[PDB]
CSV table of N, CA and C (backbone and C1' of nucleotides) and ligand atoms in Angstrom, one decimal:
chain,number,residue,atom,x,y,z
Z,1,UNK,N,147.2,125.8,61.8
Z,1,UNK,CA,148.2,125.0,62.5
Z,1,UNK,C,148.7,125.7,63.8
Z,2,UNK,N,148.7,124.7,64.9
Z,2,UNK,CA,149.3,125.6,65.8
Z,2,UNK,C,150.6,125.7,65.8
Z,3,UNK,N,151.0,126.6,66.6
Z,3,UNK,CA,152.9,127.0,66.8
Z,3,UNK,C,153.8,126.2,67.1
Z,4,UNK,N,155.0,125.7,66.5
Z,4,UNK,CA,155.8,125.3,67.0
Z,4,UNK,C,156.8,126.3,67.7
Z,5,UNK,N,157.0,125.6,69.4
Z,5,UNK,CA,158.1,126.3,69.9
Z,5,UNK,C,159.3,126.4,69.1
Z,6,UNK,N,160.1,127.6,68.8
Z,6,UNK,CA,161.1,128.1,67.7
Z,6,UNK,C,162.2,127.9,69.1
Z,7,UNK,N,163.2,126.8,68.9
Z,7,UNK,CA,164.3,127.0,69.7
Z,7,UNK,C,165.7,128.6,69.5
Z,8,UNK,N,165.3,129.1,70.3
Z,8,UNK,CA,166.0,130.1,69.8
Z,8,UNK,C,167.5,130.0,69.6
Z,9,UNK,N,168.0,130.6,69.0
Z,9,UNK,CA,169.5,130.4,68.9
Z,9,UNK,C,170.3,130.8,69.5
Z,10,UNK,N,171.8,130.1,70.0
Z,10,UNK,CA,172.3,130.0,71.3
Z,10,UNK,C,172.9,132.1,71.4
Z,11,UNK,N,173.1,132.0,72.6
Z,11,UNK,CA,174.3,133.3,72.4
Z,11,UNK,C,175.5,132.7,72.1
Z,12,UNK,N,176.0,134.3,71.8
Z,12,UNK,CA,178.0,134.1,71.3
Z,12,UNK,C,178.3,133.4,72.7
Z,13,UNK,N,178.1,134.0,73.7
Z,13,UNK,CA,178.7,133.2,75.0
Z,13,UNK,C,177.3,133.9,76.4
Z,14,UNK,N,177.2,132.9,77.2
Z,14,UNK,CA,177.2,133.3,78.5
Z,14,UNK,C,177.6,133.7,79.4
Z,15,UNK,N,177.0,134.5,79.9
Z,15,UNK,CA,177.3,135.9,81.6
Z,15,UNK,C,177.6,134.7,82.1
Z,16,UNK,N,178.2,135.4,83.6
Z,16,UNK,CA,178.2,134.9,84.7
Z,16,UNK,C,177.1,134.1,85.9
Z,17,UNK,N,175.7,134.9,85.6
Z,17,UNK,CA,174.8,134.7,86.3
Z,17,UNK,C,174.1,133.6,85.3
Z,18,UNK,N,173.9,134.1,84.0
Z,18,UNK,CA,173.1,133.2,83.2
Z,18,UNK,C,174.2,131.5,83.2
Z,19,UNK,N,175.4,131.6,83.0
Z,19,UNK,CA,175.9,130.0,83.3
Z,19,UNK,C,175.5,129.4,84.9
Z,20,UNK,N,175.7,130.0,85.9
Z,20,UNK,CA,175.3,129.9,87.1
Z,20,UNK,C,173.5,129.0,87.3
Z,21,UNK,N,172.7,130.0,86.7
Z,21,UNK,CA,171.8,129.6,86.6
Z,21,UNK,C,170.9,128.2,85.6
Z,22,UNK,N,171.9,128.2,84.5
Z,22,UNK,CA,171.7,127.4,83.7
Z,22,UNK,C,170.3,128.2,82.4
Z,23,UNK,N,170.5,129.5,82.8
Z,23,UNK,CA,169.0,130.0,81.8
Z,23,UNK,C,169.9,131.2,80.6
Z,24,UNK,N,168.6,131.3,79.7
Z,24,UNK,CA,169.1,131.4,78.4
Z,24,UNK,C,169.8,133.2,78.3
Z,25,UNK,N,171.2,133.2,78.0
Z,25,UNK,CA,172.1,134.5,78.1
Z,25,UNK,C,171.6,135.5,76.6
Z,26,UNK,N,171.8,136.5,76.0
Z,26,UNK,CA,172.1,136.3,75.1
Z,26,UNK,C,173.2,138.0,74.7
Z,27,UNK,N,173.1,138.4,73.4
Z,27,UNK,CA,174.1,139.2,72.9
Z,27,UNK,C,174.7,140.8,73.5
Z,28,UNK,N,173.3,141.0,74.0
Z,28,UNK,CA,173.7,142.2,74.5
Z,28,UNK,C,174.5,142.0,76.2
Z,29,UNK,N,175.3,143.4,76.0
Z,29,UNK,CA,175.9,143.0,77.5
Z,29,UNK,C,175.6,144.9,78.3
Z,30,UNK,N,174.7,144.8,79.6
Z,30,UNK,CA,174.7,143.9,80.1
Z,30,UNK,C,173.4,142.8,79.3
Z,31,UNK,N,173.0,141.5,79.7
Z,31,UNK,CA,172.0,140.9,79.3
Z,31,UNK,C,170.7,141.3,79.7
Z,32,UNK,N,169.5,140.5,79.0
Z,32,UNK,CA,168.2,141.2,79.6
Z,32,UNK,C,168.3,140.8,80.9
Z,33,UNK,N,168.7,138.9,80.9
Z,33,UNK,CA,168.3,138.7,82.7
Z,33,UNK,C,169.2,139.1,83.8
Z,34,UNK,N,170.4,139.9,83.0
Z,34,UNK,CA,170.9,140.8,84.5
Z,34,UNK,C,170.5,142.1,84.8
Z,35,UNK,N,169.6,142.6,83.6
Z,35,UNK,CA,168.9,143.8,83.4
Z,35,UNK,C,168.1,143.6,84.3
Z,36,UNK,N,166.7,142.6,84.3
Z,36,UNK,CA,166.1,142.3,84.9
Z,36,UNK,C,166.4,141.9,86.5
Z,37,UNK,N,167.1,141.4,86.8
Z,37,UNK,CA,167.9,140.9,88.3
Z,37,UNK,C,168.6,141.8,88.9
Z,38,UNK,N,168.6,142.8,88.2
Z,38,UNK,CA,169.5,144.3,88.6
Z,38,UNK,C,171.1,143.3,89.2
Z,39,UNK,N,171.7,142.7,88.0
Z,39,UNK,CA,172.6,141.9,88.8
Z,39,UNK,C,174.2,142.2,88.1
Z,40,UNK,N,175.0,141.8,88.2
Z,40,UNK,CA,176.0,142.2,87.7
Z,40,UNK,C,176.3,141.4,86.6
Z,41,UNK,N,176.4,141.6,85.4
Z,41,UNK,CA,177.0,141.1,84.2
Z,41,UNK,C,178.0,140.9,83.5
Z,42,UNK,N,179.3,140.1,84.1
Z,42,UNK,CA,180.2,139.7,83.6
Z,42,UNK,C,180.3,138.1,82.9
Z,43,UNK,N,181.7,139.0,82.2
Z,43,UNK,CA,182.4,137.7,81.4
Z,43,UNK,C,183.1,136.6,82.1
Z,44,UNK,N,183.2,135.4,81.9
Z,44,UNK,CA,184.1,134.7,82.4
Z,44,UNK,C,185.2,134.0,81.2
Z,45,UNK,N,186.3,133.8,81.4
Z,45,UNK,CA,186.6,132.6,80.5
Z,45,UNK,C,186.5,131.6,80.8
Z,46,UNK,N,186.4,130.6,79.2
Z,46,UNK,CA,185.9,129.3,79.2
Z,46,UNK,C,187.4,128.5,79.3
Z,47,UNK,N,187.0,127.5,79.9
Z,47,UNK,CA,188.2,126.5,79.7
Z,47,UNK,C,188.4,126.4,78.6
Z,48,UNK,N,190.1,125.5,78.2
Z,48,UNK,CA,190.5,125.4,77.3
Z,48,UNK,C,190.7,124.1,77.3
Z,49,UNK,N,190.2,123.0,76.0
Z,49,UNK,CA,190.8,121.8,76.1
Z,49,UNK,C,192.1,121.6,75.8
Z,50,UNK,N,192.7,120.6,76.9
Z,50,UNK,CA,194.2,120.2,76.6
Z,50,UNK,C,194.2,119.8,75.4
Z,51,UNK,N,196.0,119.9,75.1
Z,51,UNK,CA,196.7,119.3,74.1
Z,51,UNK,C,197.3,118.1,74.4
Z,52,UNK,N,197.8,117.1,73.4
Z,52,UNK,CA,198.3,116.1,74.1
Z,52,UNK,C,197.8,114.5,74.3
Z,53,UNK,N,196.3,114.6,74.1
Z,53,UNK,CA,196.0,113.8,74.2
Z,53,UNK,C,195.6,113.0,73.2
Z,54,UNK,N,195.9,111.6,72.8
Z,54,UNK,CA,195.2,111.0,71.8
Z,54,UNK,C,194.2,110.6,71.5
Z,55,UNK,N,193.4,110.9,70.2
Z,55,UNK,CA,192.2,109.7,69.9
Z,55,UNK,C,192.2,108.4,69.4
Z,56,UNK,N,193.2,107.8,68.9
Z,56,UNK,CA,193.3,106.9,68.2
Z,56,UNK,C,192.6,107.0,66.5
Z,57,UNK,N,192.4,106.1,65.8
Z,57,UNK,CA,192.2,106.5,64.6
Z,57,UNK,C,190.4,107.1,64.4
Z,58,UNK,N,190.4,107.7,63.2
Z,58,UNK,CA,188.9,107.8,63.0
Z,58,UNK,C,187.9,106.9,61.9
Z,59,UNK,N,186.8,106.9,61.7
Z,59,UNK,CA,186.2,106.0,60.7
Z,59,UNK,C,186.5,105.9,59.9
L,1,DT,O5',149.6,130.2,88.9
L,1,DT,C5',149.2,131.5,89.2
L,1,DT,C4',150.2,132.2,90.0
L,1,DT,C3',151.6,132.3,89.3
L,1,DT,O3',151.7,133.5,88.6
L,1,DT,C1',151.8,131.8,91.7
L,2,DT,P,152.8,133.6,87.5
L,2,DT,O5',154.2,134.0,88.3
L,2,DT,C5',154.2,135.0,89.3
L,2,DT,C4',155.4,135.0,90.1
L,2,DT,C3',156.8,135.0,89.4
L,2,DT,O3',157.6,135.9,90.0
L,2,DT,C1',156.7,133.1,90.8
L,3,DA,P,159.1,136.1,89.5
L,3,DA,O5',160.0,135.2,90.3
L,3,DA,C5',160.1,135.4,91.7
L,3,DA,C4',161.2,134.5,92.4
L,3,DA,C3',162.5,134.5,91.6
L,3,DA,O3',163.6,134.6,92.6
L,3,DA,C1',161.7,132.3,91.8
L,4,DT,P,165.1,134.6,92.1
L,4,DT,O5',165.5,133.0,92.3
L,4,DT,C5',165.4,132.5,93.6
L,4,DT,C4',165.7,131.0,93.6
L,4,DT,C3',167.1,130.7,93.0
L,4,DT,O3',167.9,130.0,94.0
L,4,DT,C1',165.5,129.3,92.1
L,5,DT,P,169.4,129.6,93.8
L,5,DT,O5',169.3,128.1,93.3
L,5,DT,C5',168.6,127.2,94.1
L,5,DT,C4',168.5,125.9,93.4
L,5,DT,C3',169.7,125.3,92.7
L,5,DT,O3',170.0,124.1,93.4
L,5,DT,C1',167.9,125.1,91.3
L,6,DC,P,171.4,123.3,93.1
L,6,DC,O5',171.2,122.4,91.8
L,6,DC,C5',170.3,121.3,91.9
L,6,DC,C4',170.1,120.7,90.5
L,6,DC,C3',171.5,120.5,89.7
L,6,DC,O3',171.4,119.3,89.0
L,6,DC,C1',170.0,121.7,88.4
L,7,DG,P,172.2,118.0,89.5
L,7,DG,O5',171.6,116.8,88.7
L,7,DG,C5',170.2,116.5,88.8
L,7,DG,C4',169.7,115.9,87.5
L,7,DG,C3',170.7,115.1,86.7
L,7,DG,O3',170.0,114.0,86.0
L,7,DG,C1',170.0,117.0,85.4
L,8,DG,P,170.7,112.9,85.1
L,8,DG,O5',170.7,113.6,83.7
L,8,DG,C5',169.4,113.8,83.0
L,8,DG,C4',169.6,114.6,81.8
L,8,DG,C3',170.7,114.0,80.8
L,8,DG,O3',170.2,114.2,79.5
L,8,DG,C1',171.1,116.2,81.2
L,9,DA,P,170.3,113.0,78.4
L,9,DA,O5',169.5,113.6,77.2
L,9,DA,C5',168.3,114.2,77.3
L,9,DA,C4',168.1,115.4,76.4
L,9,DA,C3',168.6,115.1,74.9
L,9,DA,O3',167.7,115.8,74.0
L,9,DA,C1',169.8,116.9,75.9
L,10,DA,P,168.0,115.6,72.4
L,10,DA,O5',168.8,117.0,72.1
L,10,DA,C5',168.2,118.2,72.3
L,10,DA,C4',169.1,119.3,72.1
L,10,DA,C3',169.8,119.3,70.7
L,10,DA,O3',169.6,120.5,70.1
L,10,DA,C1',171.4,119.6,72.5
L,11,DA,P,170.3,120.9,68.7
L,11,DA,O5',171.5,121.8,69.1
L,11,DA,C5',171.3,122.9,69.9
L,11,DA,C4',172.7,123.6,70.1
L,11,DA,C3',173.5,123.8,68.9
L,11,DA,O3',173.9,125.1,68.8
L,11,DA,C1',174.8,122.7,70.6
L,12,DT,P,174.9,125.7,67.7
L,12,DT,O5',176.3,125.6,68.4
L,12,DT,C5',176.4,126.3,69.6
L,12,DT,C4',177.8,126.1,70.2
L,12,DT,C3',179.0,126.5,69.3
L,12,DT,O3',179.8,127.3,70.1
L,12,DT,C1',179.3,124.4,70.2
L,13,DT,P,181.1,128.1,69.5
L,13,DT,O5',182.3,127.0,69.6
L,13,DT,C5',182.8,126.7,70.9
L,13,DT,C4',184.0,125.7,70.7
L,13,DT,C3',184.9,126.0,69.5
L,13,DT,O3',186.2,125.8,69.9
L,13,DT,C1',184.1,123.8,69.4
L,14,DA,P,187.2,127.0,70.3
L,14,DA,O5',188.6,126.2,70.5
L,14,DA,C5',188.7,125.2,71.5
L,14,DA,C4',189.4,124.0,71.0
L,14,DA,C3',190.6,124.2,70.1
L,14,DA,O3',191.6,123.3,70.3
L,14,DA,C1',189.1,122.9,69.0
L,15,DA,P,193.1,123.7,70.3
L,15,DA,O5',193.8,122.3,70.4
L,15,DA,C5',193.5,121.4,71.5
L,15,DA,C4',193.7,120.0,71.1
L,15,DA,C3',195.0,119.7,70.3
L,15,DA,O3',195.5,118.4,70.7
L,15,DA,C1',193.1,119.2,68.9
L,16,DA,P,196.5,117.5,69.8
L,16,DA,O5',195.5,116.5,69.1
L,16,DA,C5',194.7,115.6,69.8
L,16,DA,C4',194.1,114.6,69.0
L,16,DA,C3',195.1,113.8,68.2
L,16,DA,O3',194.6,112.4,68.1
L,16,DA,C1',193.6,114.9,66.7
L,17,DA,P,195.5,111.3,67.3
L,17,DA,O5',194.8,111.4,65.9
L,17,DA,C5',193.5,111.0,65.7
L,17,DA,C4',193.0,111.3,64.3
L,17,DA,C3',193.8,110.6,63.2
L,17,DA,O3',192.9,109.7,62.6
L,17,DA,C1',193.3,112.9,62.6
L,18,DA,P,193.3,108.8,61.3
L,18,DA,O5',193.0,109.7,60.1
L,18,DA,C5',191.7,110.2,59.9
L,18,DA,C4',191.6,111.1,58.7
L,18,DA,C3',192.3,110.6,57.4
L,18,DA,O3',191.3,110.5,56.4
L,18,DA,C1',192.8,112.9,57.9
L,19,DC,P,191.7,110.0,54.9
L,19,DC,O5',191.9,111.4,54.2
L,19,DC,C5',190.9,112.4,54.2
L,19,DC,C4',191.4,113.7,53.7
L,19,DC,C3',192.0,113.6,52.2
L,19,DC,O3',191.4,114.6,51.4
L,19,DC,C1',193.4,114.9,53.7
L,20,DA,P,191.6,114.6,49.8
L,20,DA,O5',192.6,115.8,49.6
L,20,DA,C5',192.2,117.2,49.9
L,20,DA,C4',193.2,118.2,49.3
L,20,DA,C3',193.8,117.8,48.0
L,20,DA,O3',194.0,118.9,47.2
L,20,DA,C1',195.5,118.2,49.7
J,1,DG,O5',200.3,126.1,57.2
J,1,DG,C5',200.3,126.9,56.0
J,1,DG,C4',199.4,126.2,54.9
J,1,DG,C3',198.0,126.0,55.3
J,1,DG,O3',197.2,127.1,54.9
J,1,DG,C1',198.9,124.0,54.3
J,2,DT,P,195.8,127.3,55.5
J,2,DT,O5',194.9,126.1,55.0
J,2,DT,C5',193.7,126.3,54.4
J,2,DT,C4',193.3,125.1,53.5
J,2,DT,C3',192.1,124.3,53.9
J,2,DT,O3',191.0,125.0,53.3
J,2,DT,C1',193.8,122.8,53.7
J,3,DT,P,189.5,124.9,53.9
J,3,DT,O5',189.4,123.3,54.4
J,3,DT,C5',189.2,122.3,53.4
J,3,DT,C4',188.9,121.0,54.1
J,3,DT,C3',187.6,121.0,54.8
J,3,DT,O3',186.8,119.9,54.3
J,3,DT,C1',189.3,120.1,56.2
J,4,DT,P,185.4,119.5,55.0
J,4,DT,O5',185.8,118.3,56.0
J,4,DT,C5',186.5,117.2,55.5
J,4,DT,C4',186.7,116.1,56.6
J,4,DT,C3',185.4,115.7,57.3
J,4,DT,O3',185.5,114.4,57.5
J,4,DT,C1',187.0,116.5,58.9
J,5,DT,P,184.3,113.5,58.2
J,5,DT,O5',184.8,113.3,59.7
J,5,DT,C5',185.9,112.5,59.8
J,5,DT,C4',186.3,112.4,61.3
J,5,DT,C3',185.2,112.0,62.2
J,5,DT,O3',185.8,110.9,63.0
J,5,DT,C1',186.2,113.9,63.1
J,6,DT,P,184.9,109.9,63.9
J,6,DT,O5',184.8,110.7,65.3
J,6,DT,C5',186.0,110.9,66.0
J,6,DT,C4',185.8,111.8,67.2
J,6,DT,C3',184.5,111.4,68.0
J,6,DT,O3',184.8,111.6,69.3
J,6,DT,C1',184.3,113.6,67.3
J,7,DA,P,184.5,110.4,70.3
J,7,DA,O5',185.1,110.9,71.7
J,7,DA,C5',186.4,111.2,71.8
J,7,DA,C4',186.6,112.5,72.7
J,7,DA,C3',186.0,112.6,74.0
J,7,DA,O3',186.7,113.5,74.8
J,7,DA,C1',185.0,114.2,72.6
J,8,DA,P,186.6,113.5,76.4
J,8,DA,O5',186.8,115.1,76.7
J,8,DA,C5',188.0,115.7,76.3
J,8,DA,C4',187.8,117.2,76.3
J,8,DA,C3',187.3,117.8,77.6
J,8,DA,O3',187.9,119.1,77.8
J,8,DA,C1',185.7,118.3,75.8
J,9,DT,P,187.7,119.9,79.2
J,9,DT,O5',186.5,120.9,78.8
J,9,DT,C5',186.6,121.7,77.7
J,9,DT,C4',185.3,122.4,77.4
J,9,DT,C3',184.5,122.9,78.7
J,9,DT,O3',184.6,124.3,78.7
J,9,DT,C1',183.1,121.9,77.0
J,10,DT,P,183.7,125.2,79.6
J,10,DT,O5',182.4,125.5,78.7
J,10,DT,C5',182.5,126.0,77.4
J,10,DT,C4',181.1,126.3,76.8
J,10,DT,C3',180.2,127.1,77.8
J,10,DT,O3',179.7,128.2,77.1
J,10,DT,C1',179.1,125.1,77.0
J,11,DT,P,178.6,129.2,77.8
J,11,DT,O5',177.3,128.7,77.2
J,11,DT,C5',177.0,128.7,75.8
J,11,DT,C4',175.7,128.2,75.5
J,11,DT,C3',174.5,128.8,76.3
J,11,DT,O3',173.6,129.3,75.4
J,11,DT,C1',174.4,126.5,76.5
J,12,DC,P,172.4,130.2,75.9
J,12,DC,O5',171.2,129.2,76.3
J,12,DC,C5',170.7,128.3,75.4
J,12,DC,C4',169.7,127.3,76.1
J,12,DC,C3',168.7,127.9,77.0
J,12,DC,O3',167.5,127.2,77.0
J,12,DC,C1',169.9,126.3,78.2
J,13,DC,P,166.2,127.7,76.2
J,13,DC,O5',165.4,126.3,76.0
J,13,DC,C5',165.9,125.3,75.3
J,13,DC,C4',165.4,123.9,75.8
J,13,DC,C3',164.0,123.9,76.3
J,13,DC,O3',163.4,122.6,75.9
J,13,DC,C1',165.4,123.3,78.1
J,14,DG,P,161.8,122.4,75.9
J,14,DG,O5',161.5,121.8,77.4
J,14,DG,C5',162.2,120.7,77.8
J,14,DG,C4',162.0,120.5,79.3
J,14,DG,C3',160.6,120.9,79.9
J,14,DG,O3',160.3,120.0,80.9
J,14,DG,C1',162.3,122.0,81.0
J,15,DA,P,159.1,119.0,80.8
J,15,DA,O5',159.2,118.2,82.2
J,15,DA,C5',160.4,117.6,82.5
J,15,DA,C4',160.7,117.9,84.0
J,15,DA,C3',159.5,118.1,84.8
J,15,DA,O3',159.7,117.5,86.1
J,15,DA,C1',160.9,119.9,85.2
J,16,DA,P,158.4,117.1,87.0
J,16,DA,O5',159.0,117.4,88.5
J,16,DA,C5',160.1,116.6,89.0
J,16,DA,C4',161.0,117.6,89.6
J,16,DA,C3',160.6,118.2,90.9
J,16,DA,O3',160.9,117.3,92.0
J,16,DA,C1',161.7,119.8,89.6
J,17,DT,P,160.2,117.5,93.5
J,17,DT,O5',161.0,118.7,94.1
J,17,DT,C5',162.4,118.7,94.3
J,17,DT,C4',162.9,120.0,94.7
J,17,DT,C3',162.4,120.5,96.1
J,17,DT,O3',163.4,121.1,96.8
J,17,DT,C1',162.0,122.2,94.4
J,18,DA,P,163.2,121.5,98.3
J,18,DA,O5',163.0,123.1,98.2
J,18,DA,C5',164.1,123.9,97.6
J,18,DA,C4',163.8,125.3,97.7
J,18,DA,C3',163.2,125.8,99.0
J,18,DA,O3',164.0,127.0,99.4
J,18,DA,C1',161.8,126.5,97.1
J,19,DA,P,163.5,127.9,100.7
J,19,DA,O5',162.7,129.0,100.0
J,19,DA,C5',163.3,129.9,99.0
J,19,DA,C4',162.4,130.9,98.5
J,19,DA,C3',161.7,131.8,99.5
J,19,DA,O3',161.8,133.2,99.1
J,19,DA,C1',160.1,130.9,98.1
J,20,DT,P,161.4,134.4,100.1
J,20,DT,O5',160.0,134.7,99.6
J,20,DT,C5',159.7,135.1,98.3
J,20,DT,C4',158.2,135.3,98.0
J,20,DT,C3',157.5,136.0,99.1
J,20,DT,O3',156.9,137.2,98.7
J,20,DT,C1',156.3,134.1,98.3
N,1,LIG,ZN1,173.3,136.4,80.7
N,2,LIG,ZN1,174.2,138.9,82.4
DNA sequence: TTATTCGGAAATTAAAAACA
DNA sequence: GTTTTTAATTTCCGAATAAT
């Protein structure tokens, strides 16, 4: 049988450069592809969704 | 050819809602 | 107080364009 591509599993979170670029971050910091890009590897924080707002009922 | 860009599918996630 | 629902948000696939 041939291979199925194994989607790999996500990181805890994304660098700065890897959200930027949209390519795959993962656990170690710095990451491989800032390792590789000789680039700088920071954290950002993620938004927070508001409070406050309603959904109306559920199924 | 490799490097960069990015649209959007898929995955994550947290307040609302529902439940105990 | 638990847990479930499901839309805000994030991740990164993959297919394009840009650079080399
Ligand atoms: Zn990264
Ligand atoms: Zn990084």
């Amino acid at each position: 049988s041939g291979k199925v591509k194994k989607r790999l599993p996500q990181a805890k979170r994304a660098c700065a450069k890897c959200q930027k670029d949209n390519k795959k971050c993962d656990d170690a910091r710095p990451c491989q592809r800032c390792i590789k890009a000789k680039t700088d590897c920071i954290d950002l924080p993620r938004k927070k969704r508001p409070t406050g707002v309603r959904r109306g009922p559920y199924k």
